[PDB]
Design an enzyme around this catalytic site. Structure first.
Site, mmCIF file in Angstrom:
data_model
loop_
_atom_site.group_PDB
_atom_site.id
_atom_site.type_symbol
_atom_site.label_atom_id
_atom_site.label_comp_id
_atom_site.label_asym_id
_atom_site.label_seq_id
_atom_site.Cartn_x
_atom_site.Cartn_y
_atom_site.Cartn_z
ATOM 1 N N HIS A 16 0.826 -1.197 0.000
ATOM 2 C CA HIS A 16 0.000 0.000 0.000
ATOM 3 C C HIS A 16 0.877 1.271 0.000
ATOM 4 C CE1 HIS A 16 -4.075 1.916 1.314
ATOM 5 N NE2 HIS A 16 -3.297 2.856 0.799
ATOM 6 N N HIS A 41 2.078 5.058 -1.277
ATOM 7 C CA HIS A 41 1.808 6.286 -2.048
ATOM 8 C C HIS A 41 3.177 6.913 -2.377
ATOM 9 C CE1 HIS A 41 -2.638 6.885 -0.805
ATOM 10 N NE2 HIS A 41 -2.222 5.900 -0.029
ATOM 11 N N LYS A 69 -6.167 0.656 -8.642
ATOM 12 C CA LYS A 69 -6.742 1.061 -7.360
ATOM 13 C C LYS A 69 -8.129 1.717 -7.558
ATOM 14 C CE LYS A 69 -7.085 2.565 -3.029
ATOM 15 N NZ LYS A 69 -5.929 3.356 -2.588
ATOM 16 N N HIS A 74 -10.611 3.927 -5.580
ATOM 17 C CA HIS A 74 -10.641 4.787 -4.401
ATOM 18 C C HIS A 74 -11.889 5.672 -4.346
ATOM 19 C CE1 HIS A 74 -9.400 7.529 -1.250
ATOM 20 N NE2 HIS A 74 -8.337 6.776 -1.012
ATOM 21 N N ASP A 96 -12.313 8.638 -3.365
ATOM 22 C CA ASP A 96 -11.995 10.005 -3.776
ATOM 23 C C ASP A 96 -12.125 10.189 -5.297
ATOM 24 O OD1 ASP A 96 -11.503 10.256 -1.045
ATOM 25 O OD2 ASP A 96 -9.525 11.199 -1.215
ATOM 26 N N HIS A 151 -10.520 0.901 -1.770
ATOM 27 C CA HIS A 151 -10.809 1.710 -0.597
ATOM 28 C C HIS A 151 -12.268 2.069 -0.875
ATOM 29 C CE1 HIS A 151 -9.992 5.695 1.754
ATOM 30 N NE2 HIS A 151 -11.265 5.694 1.405
ATOM 31 N N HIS A 206 -6.769 -1.377 4.026
ATOM 32 C CA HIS A 206 -7.132 -1.091 5.405
ATOM 33 C C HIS A 206 -8.538 -1.532 5.720
ATOM 34 C CE1 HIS A 206 -8.791 2.208 3.218
ATOM 35 N NE2 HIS A 206 -7.584 2.703 2.977
ATOM 36 N N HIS A 231 -9.254 15.419 6.116
ATOM 37 C CA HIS A 231 -10.558 15.781 5.506
ATOM 38 C C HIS A 231 -10.956 17.260 5.642
ATOM 39 C CE1 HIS A 231 -12.219 11.652 4.373
ATOM 40 N NE2 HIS A 231 -11.074 11.397 4.985
ATOM 41 N N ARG A 238 -15.912 7.137 11.508
ATOM 42 C CA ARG A 238 -14.758 6.617 10.764
ATOM 43 C C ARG A 238 -13.719 5.999 11.666
ATOM 44 N NH1 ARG A 238 -12.580 7.850 5.413
ATOM 45 N NH2 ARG A 238 -10.440 7.800 6.152
ATOM 46 N N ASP A 242 0.593 2.463 3.937
ATOM 47 C CA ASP A 242 -0.144 3.691 3.608
ATOM 48 C C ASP A 242 0.788 4.913 3.693
ATOM 49 O OD1 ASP A 242 -2.413 4.916 2.561
ATOM 50 O OD2 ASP A 242 -3.711 4.407 4.173
HETATM 51 NI NI NI Z 1 -7.389 4.316 1.465
HETATM 52 NI NI NI Z 2 -3.810 4.907 0.871
#
Ligand code: NI
Ligand code: NI
Ligand code: NI
Ligand code: NI
Lengths: 833, 140, 140, 833
Positions: free
Chosen positions: A404, A406, A487, A489, A491, A516, A542, A590, A606, A630
């Site tokens: 995972h 980034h 992926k 996601h 978002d 995700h 996750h 966020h 969350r 992550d």
């Molecule tokens: Ni995520």
């Molecule tokens: Ni992530």
């Protein structure tokens, strides 16, 4: 100032000493790292002063920090402190052996020159009551059983000292040693592998000699006995002993027998068992504490034949014609051998030599020279052209695999290899809004660029595209560009339509889909996303959900047979700061307001103590199969390993045993960041475990530091990164010791040692050729038929429910509750910040 | 006729009136390197087995008459790494007298049969006009 | 030295060789029918061999340049796959450095008759009506 | 914090100031480097304060540190301190000239802001009574002898200032200067090379003019006189002076003569001799102290023709048509010229310009423009396309060559180039047990890798395989892989059989065998190893033996005609901490116990005052030919040079002179780390001395810092590494100045500038092509016929005996004894730690 590099480093070393000085003045008990910086710092200042000699500082260094000033582990961790500095008579090396040589130290002198007020003793906490300790089985071991033996009188008639190593062919000795050369034929000293008998001039010794093994061929030394041991070559050796004046007096009476396995046979040599562990590392039955956790690995199997261990050094076993072979076909010499390694790996905790050839693990077993040792197979030959990495006393594991990632900054990368990670899988293009939120390299152009970008870095890499689409059109394109996974996601939208369209693509291209889920349940609750899977393999990131997904019950996915689930690491394990940290972290990521009712509602939905508590358990259950970072998007690249063991330590202590040792748990967990990330992403034939045929991506650990800081990282057969001290120094260990890239990280080498993973479709087009990549490129595969049952030692499938109000998790009818730990191992003892 | 001429024999150059006399031969009569079914260059016989692999000749030219400014002789020629490695008696030191360590025919050695042929250096033309590429093919 | 080597049949020596070895590998050679059961059936002609295909020609040969050009690595600049070496040891040569061809006669030439005298001796030679290495060998 | 790079650096600069602050508060007299950090640090803080102006800090900076607070060398070393900082009105540069401008400084103000107690004066030691000093011969030099001359009246009739440089063609001046242009034809000012005469408006000056030299061709300026000087071009120049209105009044009466070599001739110009040395560096007869040692180099020969020195700058000599040529064939312009260099090299200590072309040293001599200067050969032309490196005042030596390298970490490498090393020869694969003990790259695979690894690094490299074998089989293979030498090490077995087999191979492949003999005399005493040589060339590493070999008498090898012997550097020279340091170092490397009788016996047999004392001498004798590092395996990469000079300084002081200067000794020693390592390893045609035809691997030194810290490292013609200050600053000299890689160290450049050395057999196969190497690859050769007599200036062959009990060494009948020095130069004055 004309500062040389060494001057610049020592300035940093100093700054660390002074920080450690400030902490000590506050009456903090210092850890390992603090003790080291402090002492090296003072040693350099005393040298600047010009008043004291090397011999002085060797004593003074022992009397700075005392048991009272240090943490309970420190007196076992700090075997010594070394530094070099410019004395009035040039640079000299100072070693301080066992620096905690007393109870009170000497505070004033530990601070002297810092102009910091000297604290009184009572400012320091009171002493509490050993990381990586070896628990030895009681007893002795008879060396070299089942072999012809003889005791012979030996005299040094020379005027200078003569010393003989354990494996030297005795007939081949200095011609000034007088003994019965004919009895010595085919024999060597029966002493512990790697030591020696010293003959001062004129000395007489009664030596136990034992027959060599394997084929019994003698090579080297003086060429007295060149050849296989037999009555015909004996006669020739005697001729040459006479002709060449090698000292010889017949000992008609010499005691002859063999090494029987019984008590009080005068021909045998025994090694005290605690001493064996200390020389060669632990053997079958011994146990090793993992770092400063409560975990104990017991050696399940040893390949060693006691007495023939591969140890390299002056007088030692790995020398021409002895343990190092001479005459086998040159093509089969190992490139490198890791000697006497404890291997901890999902598939077994064992003791073995490890043979490396062509960047691959070639063999695991008893290594050496078939001409002189029993039990050496043809794929385990230490030859002239074989490098030695000495693993005695150390643990070897596979390179960790973080799946995972980034790609927010290049530094994540160095932080990863330095912690023991050799493969990274994720997405990104640098510090953009998209990459900071998602593991997505979205454009074909950016795929090309990230593969080109990372081409010299000594890690295997996989890049994943943006899977969020309700049409396959652009997904085809990103995979053809070289993405090895997609992926999904929230978002970018993780709706049932996008999920279906993305998985239909995965079925075509044999790549893994990481997801995700939709936290907002905007489109569906978890049920609806699970339905959209339609029984197809999918990796859930996750899976607990703090890091993202269906509130409050994404965790339910750990019970779907087609789901492969991972955790990210920051929620591992549930400790006292966890919840507070995560709420804020959520608020920050966020852009939420503590003072707006619904911002605080989303956040509390969350981040959930009940689910994080449940994650500790399902992790221990083998219900969550992988731990990942992550990196910099809620998680921490350098802590995939420590957080795995921290979780395992807390569960040991909270729950029942899993199958008089911790082997089952140890194996279950190591698989979470080694083999299971490689299975799930489709490249487990190349990496992810210490097994023959895979890349030699191998990490060397000191047991005392295991799961915190490794010693050395071997990438495809060559050291890539390692602890290294002062580059100007006479040895590699003097301060400042820090993790540094090695020769496997320079120029063209990183590429030669590693793999870039792509989709089969991209390799079909030769993107390796198109992109001008020097790194080897391979396709991921065997990913669309995986189920939770393909996860090594982590195949559990509980029926999970989650109470929508209390968030309480139930697995197989049992309510999951776990305590909030106040501390964790692999932290305060190891880190400077 | 079997192995090409030896010391004392003479060879007419083409259809000219020139005769070249073998000045020196490295052959030990009876151990000539000849390759073929039932012939000398076979595993453990003329082809060595067990010497260090790195010293096997890449190619051996067997039983060559060499005409060169430096001598007209009879010799085996060993080639290694694109270079002339040695000139003399070649074969297998385990079975034949007179084989030096730089003339081993081994498993990994190719064979060009010179028996009955002349070898000379490649010619060097040092007045070339590069008018067309086909001059080149005509040259080689 | 490079194994640049030409194999000859004595019956054809000086007219048409069998085989040209370039840097240890056969570059060009007589070759018959590519479809045939052996290499010798008609039409046999000189054809390029494996040493002349792809990258091989370059791996087997040398481009010669001045030392100055090599000091600048023109091999790198020009993208050459052929080995590049510098020429040298040319400014101190005299006629005496020519192997077996170091003769230095006093020569005079009569400006009207064109008669050449070497070391006092008038040089005259007959006009040969034929030469070898021609009619026996060539189809045109 | 959004820290820019400059902010990060200055933080380090600060930390150095504060350390220097702590030391000062303890009443330590500061060295050069400390004085600089301290002052720049305070200057930046005063700027942070915002109270003081640039002009203020320029005065304040002089009154911080006084003679009392600094070491005896400092007032001559610290010419000034520069730093830049953000004042209220942006970044400004502060230069503090001659910062030790007083006796007591101002302690309070030197510590102000540090919150360190201000020490009183009596806490400081009492002042003691000049590194790199030039000792000038007494007298003057007449410039430009043997040339037509004239004195002319010149008037500036313009309204702005006009200034004319020493080499400008006088007829070509600003048309507002009025004088007799016809007399000025072909002339230039007779003043020191590189200065000028300034005419304020309306000013009248009486100027000495002298004729130009060489071909006498005028180019540039205004094109008034374009062409060779002759009666026909004079007429044309006069036409153009009239037409174009260039100021001209006939001076019928002007005094005319020439520059005669006698006293009081009004046409000649003399330069005070001390002043000459200061402008252009020393000339024939002057002497230069090497660093802060007691060594003096006397200039043996100067190529300069006094008055035509090549100096580049505004108004200076190297300008279009003057010293910079215009019209020669463009292909022969030098790429770079090093102007006015003192060259110290085994072959001679001289003064010369150095011409670089195609990365090679093209010429050594008097450089410039043949159109205007006498004595300029066709291979010494400064042209339009010629870069200038200004060596006036500086020493140039060849790049050092370290031939005992262990590739333990990449940082050794930067530490090496930064100290003045440009070639490394050794073995290794990174920080493994084998490489930490031996200079061996054992596998073919690792050869490929280390050559690929080091491909971008701007140093020449050679790698050596493991020579320890009783059969040649694998030795063939490692040399074919690309090893350029083999190492025989006891740790792999250095038995007579291995020694023979290894040297027989060396005879085949023309590579050098380096050996570390059998310390244990396990197989033979030294006699037996010498016999095994069988008269064949062999390089013996650390021939004295502390670093390894036959106890106690390996040193005997310095008397064998076929032995080339080196020392490693840590035992150089015998000083008061030497023995204590080495015993422990030995104990640490061999894992020995201070409390076990035989561990302490082995150790005392290895580390020996008598033999180390003898090594100082045989070193001075020219009986040991090379000094090397043993980088991080008992030795120190950055100290090959300093330790060589430290040894030479101690012997000067202990023994008789060697042949009113130190030239013979200086040359003897410089050859130990330049030419002799290249001869012994077989690449002396490429590197190892400042001679035409070799690579321009050249190191620029300030005499005050010579043999401690160099200024600049030129790799194959291009600066590779150098002292560099603040990258944001208006000049390159402001703090923090530190050794940094330059443009020769980036991207593809390191490869373009350097050589990787292999065996001829490896090059026969084109391993350069196989390995995809961008660095030039060449074969080592001419190594199997060397004897001690091939070692430049180090060819001595004493009959040596060693007492087996007292360890006393006797050479040619003389008992070798030497004192334990308490201090060494090139240390306390230079280093921050
Ligand atoms: Ni995520
Ligand atoms: Ni992530
Ligand atoms: Ni050594
Ligand atoms: Ni060494």
């Amino acid at each position: 100032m004309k500062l040389s590099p060494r001057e610049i480093e020592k300035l940093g070393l100093h700054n660390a000493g002074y920080l450690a000085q400030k902490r000590l003045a506050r009456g903090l008990r210092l850890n390992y790292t603090e003790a080291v910086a402090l002492i090296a710092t003072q040693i350099m200042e005393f040298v600047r002063d010009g008043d004291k000699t090397v011999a002085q500082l060797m004593s003074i260094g022992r009397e700075l920090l005392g048991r009272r000033q240090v943490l309970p582990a420190v007196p076992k961790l700090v075997e010594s402190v070394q530094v070099e500095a410019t004395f009035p008579d040039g640079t000299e090396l100072v070693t301080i052996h066992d620096p905690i040589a007393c109870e009170n130290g000497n505070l004033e002198l530990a601070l002297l020159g810092s102009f910091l007020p000297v604290p009184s003793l009572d400012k320091f906490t009171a002493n509490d009551e050993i990381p990586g300790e070896i628990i030895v089985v009681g007893g002795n071991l008879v060396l070299n059983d089942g072999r012809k033996a003889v005791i012979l009188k030996v005299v040094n008639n020379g005027d200078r000292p003569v010393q003989v190593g354990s494996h030297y062919h005795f007939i081949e000795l200095n011609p000034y040693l007088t003994f019965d050369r004919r009895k010595a034929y085919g024999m060597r000293l029966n002493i512990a592998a790697g030591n020696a008998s010293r003959f001062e001039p004129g000395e007489m010794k009664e030596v136990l000699l034992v027959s060599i093994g394997g084929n019994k061929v003698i090579r080297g030394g003086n060429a007295i006995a060149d050849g296989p041991v037999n009555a015909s070559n004996c006669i020739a050796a005697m001729q040459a002993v006479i002709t060449r004046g090698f000292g010889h007096v017949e000992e008609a009476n010499a005691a002859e027998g063999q090494t029987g396995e019984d008590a009080s046979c005068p021909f045998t040599t025994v090694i005290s068992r605690e001493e064996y562990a200390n020389k060669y590392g632990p053997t079958t039955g011994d146990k090793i504490r993992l770092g400063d956790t409560a975990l104990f690995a017991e050696i399940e199997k040893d390949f060693a034949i006691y007495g023939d261990e591969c140890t390299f050094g002056g007088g030692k076993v790995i020398r021409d014609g002895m343990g190092q072979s001479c005459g086998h076909p040159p093509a089969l010499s190992l490139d490198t051998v890791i000697t006497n390694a404890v291997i901890i790996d999902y598939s077994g905790i064992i003791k073995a030599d490890i043979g490396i050839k062509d960047g691959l693990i070639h063999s695991i077993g008893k290594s050496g020279n078939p001409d002189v040792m029993d039990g050496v197979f043809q794929n385990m030959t230490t030859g002239v052209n074989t490098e030695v990495i000495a693993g005695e006393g150390l643990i070897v594991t596979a390179g960790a695999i973080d799946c995972h990632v980034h790609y927010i900054c290049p530094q994540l990368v160095y932080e990863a290899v330095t912690s023991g990670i050799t493969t990274l899988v994720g997405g990104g293009t640098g510090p953009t809004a998209g990459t900071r939120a998602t593991t997505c390299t979205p454009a074909p152009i950016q795929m090309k660029l990230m593969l080109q970008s990372t081409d010299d870095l000594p890690l295997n890499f996989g890049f994943t595209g943006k899977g969020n689409c309700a049409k396959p059109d652009e997904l085809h394109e990103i995979i053809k560009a070289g993405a090895m996974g997609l992926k999904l996601h929230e978002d970018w939208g993780t709706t049932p339509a996008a999920i279906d369209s993305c998985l239909t693509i995965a079925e075509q291209y044999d790549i893994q889909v990481n997801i995700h889920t939709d936290t907002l349940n905007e489109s569906g609750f978890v049920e609806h996303t699970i339905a959209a899977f339609k029984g197809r393999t999918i990796h859930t990131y996750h899976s607990e959900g703090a890091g993202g997904g269906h509130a409050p019950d994404i965790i339910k996915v750990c019970g779907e047979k087609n789901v492969l689930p991972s955790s990210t690491n920051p929620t591992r394990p549930l400790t006292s700061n966890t919840i507070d940290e995560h709420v804020d972290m959520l608020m920050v990521c966020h852009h939420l307001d503590a003072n707006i009712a619904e911002d605080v509602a989303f956040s509390a939905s969350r981040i959930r103590e009940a689910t994080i508590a449940a994650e500790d358990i399902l992790h221990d259950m083998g219900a969550i199969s992988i731990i990942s970072s992550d990196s910099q998007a809620m998680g921490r690249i350098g802590e995939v390993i420590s957080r795995t063991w921290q979780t395992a330590d807390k569960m040991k202590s909270a729950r029942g045993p899993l199958q008089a040792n911790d082997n089952f748990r140890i194996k279950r967990y190591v698989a979470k960041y080694t083999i299971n990330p490689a299975i799930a992403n489709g490249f487990s034939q190349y990496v992810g475990s210490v097994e023959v045929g895979k890349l030699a991506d191998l990490v060397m650990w000191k047991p005392s530091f295991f799961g915190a800081k490794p010693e050395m990282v071997i990438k495809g057969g060559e050291v890539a990164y390692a602890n290294m001290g002062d580059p100007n120094a006479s040895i590699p260990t003097p301060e400042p010791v820090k993790m540094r890239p090695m020769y496997g990280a320079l120029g063209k080498a990183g590429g030669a040692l590693s793999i870039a993973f792509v989709s089969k479709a991209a390799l079909d087009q030769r993107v390796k050729v198109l992109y001008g990549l020097n790194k080897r490129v391979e396709a991921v595969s065997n990913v669309r038929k995986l189920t939770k049952l393909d996860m090594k030692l982590n195949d559990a499938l509980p029926a999970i429910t989650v109470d929508p109000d209390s968030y309480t998790v139930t697995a197989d009818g049992v309510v999951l509750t776990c305590f909030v730990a106040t501390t964790v191992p692999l932290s305060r003892n190891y880190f400077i910040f | 006729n079997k192995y090409g001429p030896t010391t004392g024999d003479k060879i007419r150059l083409g259809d000219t009136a020139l005769f070249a006399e073998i000045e020196k031969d490295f052959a030990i009569y009876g151990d000539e390197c000849t390759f073929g079914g039932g012939k000398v260059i076979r595993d453990g016989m003329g082809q060595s087995c067990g010497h260090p692999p790195a010293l096997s000749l890449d190619t051996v030219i067997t039983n060559a008459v060499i005409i060169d400014y430096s001598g007209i002789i009879k010799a085996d020629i060993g080639i290694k790494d694109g270079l002339i490695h040695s000139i003399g008696k070649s074969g297998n030191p385990d079975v034949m007298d007179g084989v030096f360590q730089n003339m081993t025919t081994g498993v990994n050695t190719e064979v060009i049969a010179g028996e009955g042929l002349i070898v000379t250096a490649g010619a060097i033309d040092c007045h070339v006009h590069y008018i067309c590429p086909q001059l080149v093919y005509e040259a080689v | 030295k490079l194994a640049d080597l030409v194999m000859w049949k004595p019956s054809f020596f000086g007219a048409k060789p069998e085989m040209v070895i370039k840097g240890g590998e056969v570059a060009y050679a007589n070759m018959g029918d590519p479809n045939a059961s052996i290499p010798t059936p008609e039409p046999v002609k000189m054809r390029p061999m494996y040493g002349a295909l792809g990258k091989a020609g370059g791996a087997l040969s040398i481009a010669f340049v001045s030392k100055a050009a090599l000091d600048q690595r023109v091999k790198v600049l020009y993208g050459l796959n052929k080995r590049v070496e510098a020429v040298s040891n040319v400014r101190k040569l005299t006629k005496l450095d020519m192997k077996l061809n170091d003769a230095l006669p006093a020569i005079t030439v009569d400006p009207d008759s064109y008669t050449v005298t070497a070391d006092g001796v008038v040089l005259t030679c007959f006009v040969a009506t034929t030469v070898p290495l021609s009619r026996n060998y060539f189809i045109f």
